[PDB]
Amino acid sequence: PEINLPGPMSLIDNTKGQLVVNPEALKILSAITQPVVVVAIVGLYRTGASYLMNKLAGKKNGFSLGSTVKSHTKGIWMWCVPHPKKPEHTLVLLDTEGLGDIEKGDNENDSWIFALAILLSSTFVYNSMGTINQQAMDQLHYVTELTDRIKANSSPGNNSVDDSADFVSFFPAFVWTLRDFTLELEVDGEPITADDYLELSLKLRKGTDKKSKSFNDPRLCIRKFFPKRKCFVFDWPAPKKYLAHLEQLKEEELNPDFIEQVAEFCSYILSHSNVKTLSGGIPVNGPRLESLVLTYVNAISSGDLPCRENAVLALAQIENSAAVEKAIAHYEQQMGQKVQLPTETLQELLDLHRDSEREAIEVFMKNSFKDVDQMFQRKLGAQLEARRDDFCKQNSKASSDCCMALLQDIFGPLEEDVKQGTFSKPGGYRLFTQKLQELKNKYYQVPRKGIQAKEVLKKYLESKEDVADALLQTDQSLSEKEKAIEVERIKAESAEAAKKMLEEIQKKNEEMMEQKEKSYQEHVKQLTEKMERDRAQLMAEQEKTLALKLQEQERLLKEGFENESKRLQKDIWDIQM
DSSP states (O other): OOOOOOOOEESBOOBTTBOOBOHHHHHHHTTOOSBEEEEEEEEOTTSOHHHHHHHHTTOSSTTSSOSOSSSSOOSEEEEEEEOSSSTTOEEEEEEEOSTTOOOSTTOTHHHHHHHHHHHHOSEEEEEEESOSSHHHHHTTHHHHTGGGTOBSSOOSTTTTSOGGGGGGGTOOEEEEEEESOOOOOBSSSSBOOHHHHHHHHSOOOOSOSHHHHHHHHHHHHHHHHOSOEEEEEOOOSSOGGGTTOSTTOOGGGSOHHHHHHHHHHHHHHHHHOOOOEETTTEEOBHHHHHHHHHHHHHHHHTTOOOBHHHHHHHHHHHHHHHHHHHHHHHHHHHHHTSOOSSOSSHHHHHHHHHHHHHHHHHHHHHTOOOOGGGHHHHHHHHHHHHHHHHHHHHHHHHHHHHHHHHHHHHHHHHHHHHHHTTTOSTTHHHHHHHHHHHHHHHHHHOSSOOTTHHHHHHHHHHHSHHHHHHHHHHOSSSOHHHHHHHHHHHHHHHHHHHHHHHHHHHHHHHHHHHHHHHHHHHHHHHHHHHHHHHHHHHHHHHHHHHHHHHHHHHHHHHTTOHHHHHHHHHHHHHHHO
């Protein structure tokens, strides 16, 4: 038991005009089997987001050991720490490093940093200094650019729909850290909280002028895209004479305000942050987020837009194929552990195949999700049908060899007799047929002889129908009457033999069809129960989203912005389709 986790690390890195993944960053990611809590700390540079990280990572003095371990490190940076309050969980921190630096060109990669941070996170701490004013809001144009950078779903029957209307269901909670905040939180001579300050700064200017759609765009975006909103204030960490020397200070000398505000913020982020989940209540861990990062960033560098749906579908297909392999492996252990190499009846074997198919489809259903078109269940069905056919091939060969060997053992002597001549005397017909029958009645007796017994035997005697036909005519003790009677009885015999042969073959083909039908029954039974739960999840999630959409339309209405609550009305309809 170690699963040791490393120090801060490049995950994405902006170079030239290209986004770049760290293959070791992913290599660490692929090792956290535990459910993760991503907490992005996003902020313009020189506002000390990295401090917030450091203390959230459990560093004693966060002012020390800056995340800028090197220079020219523009991009998203990762920290992986065991979760201090959620046991068996690992907290995953993210930081935006160079956000604001003017390098070569239009530098869109900046807003890409922003978008990507949102997509990957399950709590999104945006960090700014000062007070929320016109300038703070202008720097948040990253949020007014999201309808152009994140598509939530592909667009078939979606032209009449607003894609951004769907952001609420998978975006992280939004938390605004305002640092170096020296504002008495007073309304009209009465006190207010930090959240109260946020809600006050998130109100709208009436009008429709350019000057006023501009004022409202960012803050409509914040109240419409994120599910929760918290604000935390921070007083400067020391008086001015210490501001260039925070590292050399001990906790006893920091403004007791900062210290406290920092304790409140850390306790909150630690207890109320949630495991990043995907549509359908899917807890996300390393191997998952790893492909999330891959899919999204690879979309960005190919000239396309990140899209929650393509990404989660790709994830689904990976996990689902894993389930196919898990299931066929369960199957094969259980086949190998309860089959008689030469099967007594064909029914015994199809019945075992059916039991182990039952359990393998359970293993599948327990490890799979979003299997659209049932494509993977059908892959599993084909794989088990091919394993069943192959076993049947081996079984027929097993029984055919068991009988074909015993055929020298019982019938061998008799061939010998036909060369030594035992049957060349008067009365030889009656000597051959009667022992022939004795031995035949002996071969039948052998138990567990398996299925292709009646076929193997009969083929051999078709070889030897003519040795007795030859003897019947060359005997000298029989009359012509008797030879005629016997030709008639051998016709009858063959007749009953062919009849019973056909009756076996129909019996076998009917068993085969029972089995096919009941395997298909077991597939639908399990699949419809699975879909009855998956729909239950989707119901719960879509109800929570509806409630949030109502609260915000009622807030827009009470503030007196009916037009906005009307747009949001169109959004509620389309949720109920």
